[PDB]
Amino acid sequence: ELVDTTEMYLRTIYDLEEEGVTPLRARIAERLDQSGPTVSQTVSRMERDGLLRVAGDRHLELTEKGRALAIAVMRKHRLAERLLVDVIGLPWEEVHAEACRWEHVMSEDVERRLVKVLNNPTTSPFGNPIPGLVELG
Amino acid sequence: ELVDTTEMYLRTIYDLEEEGVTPLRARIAERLDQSGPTVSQTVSRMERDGLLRVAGDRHLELTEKGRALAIAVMRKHRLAERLLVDVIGLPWEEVHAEACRWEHVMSEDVERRLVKVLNNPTTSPFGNPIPGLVELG
Amino acid sequence: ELVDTTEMYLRTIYDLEEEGVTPLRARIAERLDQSGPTVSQTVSRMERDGLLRVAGDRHLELTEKGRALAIAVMRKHRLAERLLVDVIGLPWEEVHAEACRWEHVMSEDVERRLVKVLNNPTTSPFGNPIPGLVELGVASENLYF
Amino acid sequence: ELVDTTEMYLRTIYDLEEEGVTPLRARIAERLDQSGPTVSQTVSRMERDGLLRVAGDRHLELTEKGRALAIAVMRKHRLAERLLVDVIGLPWEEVHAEACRWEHVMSEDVERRLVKVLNNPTTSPFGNPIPGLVELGVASENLYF
DNA sequence: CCCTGTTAGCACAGGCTGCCCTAATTTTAGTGG
DNA sequence: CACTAAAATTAGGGCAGCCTGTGCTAACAGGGC
Ligand code: NI
Ligand code: NI
Ligand code: NI
Ligand code: NI
Ligand code: NI
Ligand code: NI
Ligand code: NI
Ligand code: NI
Ligand code: NI
Ligand code: NI
Ligand code: NI
Ligand code: NI
């Protein structure tokens, strides 16, 4: 359903920072409609796997490793949204729902093909900036 | 890694019908590169859920329900292939692999849009036909 | 350590009714020594599961189902208490605490058999009446004037 | 359901030593009707708490600490079995089941009273030896050749 | 040997509920001003 | 009302202990070049 739990967690956190709200496990429990214990356990794993940390104040902070992955996903997300509006012609309202699944399967090759095809876009079809276009190459 | 195990088993069984090769479990192990025990388990799970059934000769055959579903995943896989070649301009030797993943996240909404935008396609860029177009709408 | 939280909440509520005190989430807090937030949360599950209802004036009331269980656990508890004292010879100061755990594991089969071997007791050795002997299936009520 | 998971695991492994059957997580899954992943996760927990170790060949081996506790539970189990047969008269088919729950709530105080009241039983009504009475402190090991 | 499969025993990811906590805050009830 | 003590909630956790899906090797079974 999430298609890829880990990435959804990484991207959910990114969203939170973007939204200005403090990233805590409760914020994720709500947004992904999953039990409290599920988020703790999924986050533990991501911690175990050097993707993030739970600070002393229980703040969620991404590691360099994790922030790299998170960016990659948001980048695909927003490239997806673009592709869906400019080219495919999917109605405004459903573009996000669709991209939420696509972000998890697009390769970086297609990403780079989209940059060309879509005319060096720098923003989602909503004003939202596209992260890490530089590292994409 | 398959993204969707079930759907991949379905499309694989479909491919085997298309190619006219005898549909055995050993056949799914080779292509999906899993172990005999692994594919037997998963198959009997799909049997449990009424997607397929093992005959007397151990022939895996799709149910009514299971056939429909497969057609739909093949429809996606190949429309994805069209889009990746005709529009995105992804190199040829990589379009399948990419669409192997995209097939599992595409919405029918996106499918109907592809039909229009791709100018009523009937085949993947590789040649093979695209099924389920009528069922689509 | 409670062994069964739910049965203990019910039995607690029943002790309180026996004793005369109004049954509030806050009494359970003090009896079972648990945090307020915990006691409210546990009570929601029991409300969810149809064991009790929290009334408009915050009173805790047992449902037919809840009351049934309450008695069945009390009955188990004072039977165990009889056994331990009259048969097993455990020192008094431990027999309640023991019964507090045994109450959560004893079946109705054992209970019935206990009634016969203890020569039809009607009270725990502390004197407190054994409830639910009728619904258990081993006695009928016959009034004396 | 099991009343206390850990103790049931310990006791089940101890059971498997008695019958001389190889102590694998798979056995536990079967006997307690639980999924493999459940027992695996729970066994890690008990490893982590010094109750047992998982050998290189996956054999489950009780640590001294886990063993003491397991004997202590097995002892309660069978003491309770004697009590249910000799004294209470619970039907045979229901006795182990009842004991399977009693084993988890009986104090050692009760175990010692039961040794007296049951005239120093050495065996459960099923024929199986009651282990750990020396540790209980009611007897002394003396060897016969 | 090979092909194809089963049976027995694992791995880990990724879901869940029950039941316990502090802290901080808020709400409900009654005394007294 | 005002003010407070008891009562309860909000907010964010903890840990134990359940589950199914989907992946693996080993060991073997039986049919066959
Ligand atoms: Ni911080
Ligand atoms: Ni979006
Ligand atoms: Ni997503
Ligand atoms: Ni056939
Ligand atoms: Ni293809
Ligand atoms: Ni695929
Ligand atoms: Ni009332
Ligand atoms: Ni008592
Ligand atoms: Ni109790
Ligand atoms: Ni060994
Ligand atoms: Ni037994
Ligand atoms: Ni037990």
Quick recap of the structure?
The PDB classes it as transcription/dna. Keywords: DNA-binding protein, transcription-DNA complex. Four copies of one chain form a homotetramer. Chain A is mostly helical and 137 residues long.
User: Please, how many helices of chain A?
Assistant: 7
SS-derived structural category of chain A:
mainly alpha
Strand content of chain A: under 5%
Tertiary shape of chain A: globular
Q: How many strands of chain A? A: 2
Q: What CATH architecture label of the largest domain in chain A applies?
A: Orthogonal Bundle
Helix content of chain A: 55-70%
The radius of gyration over CA of chain A amounts to: 15 Å
Name the strands of the widest sheet of chain A in spatial order: 1-2
Explain what this protein looks like in three dimensions.
- The structure is a homotetramer.
- In chain A, helix 1 crosses helix 4 and helix 4 packs across helix 6.
- Chain A has seven helices and two strands.
- The first copy, chain A, folds into two domains: 73 residues, Winged helix-like DNA-binding domain superfamily/Winged helix DNA-binding domain (Arc Repressor Mutant, subunit A), CATH 1.10.10; 61 residues, Orthogonal Bundle (Diphtheria Toxin Repressor, domain 2).
- A two-stranded antiparallel ribbon of chain A has the order 1-2.
- One nickel (II) ion binds next to helix 4 and helix 5 of chain D.
- Chain D binds a DNA duplex (33 and 33 nucleotides) through helix 2 and helix 3.
